[PDB]
């Protein structure tokens, strides 16, 4: 008997950034720290998916801002 | 500037089970395979959270059943 488990895993990270960092840049920092490929990363803030070529300042992302990220992995 | 990213990660696993396995047992298999502590595991099927001392048969979980799991981790 084989069953399938759709595992949804929640982990909170902190990131050291400049307002001038692009979204692409942030996804690279998340890869460097957590191993999530950036093309599997969907960064979310204030009700939007964020576009790679914009900066954190473009989205008024200020310090202690709380973003979300949804990713798919094959293995942890 | 420190920001916080709430990362939600999705990964699908398959598990080799008997109808007679308890929920507790399944969470142990998921720990053994993925490293998620079983006390951080919330197994979900057909609209319910599953209770540790019940068996997969108790929930009519049949082969190719699709369960969900929600967990918190400190690190991947």
């Amino acid at each position: 008997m084989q069953i399938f488990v759709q595992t949804i895993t929640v982990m909170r990270i902190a990131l050291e950034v400049e307002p001038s960092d692009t979204i692409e840049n942030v996804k690279a920092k998340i890869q460097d720290k957590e191993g999530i490929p950036p093309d599997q990363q969907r960064l979310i803030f204030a009700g939007m998916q964020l576009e790679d070529g914009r900066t954190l300042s473009d989205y008024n992302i200020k310090r202690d801002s709380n973003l979300y990220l949804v990713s798919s992995l094959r293995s942890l | 500037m420190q920001i916080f990213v709430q990362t939600i990660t999705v990964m699908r696993i398959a598990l080799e089970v008997e109808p007679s396995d308890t929920i507790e047992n399944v969470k142990a298999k998921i720990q053994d395979k993925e490293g998620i502590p079983p006390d951080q595991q919330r197994l979900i099927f057909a609209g319910m959270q599953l209770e540790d001392g019940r068996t997969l048969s108790d929930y009519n979980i049949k082969r190719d059943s699709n369960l969900y799991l929600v967990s918190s981790l400190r690190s991947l």
Binding site: I8, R42, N66, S72 | -
Partner: peptide, 17 residues
């Protein structure tokens, strides 16, 4: 996992407000 990803994105968009 596209259909679960779209759902979770939609949920994370909600949570972000």
């Amino acid at each position: 996992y596209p259909e679960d990803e779209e759902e979770l994105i939609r949920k994370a968009i909600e949570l972000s407000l």
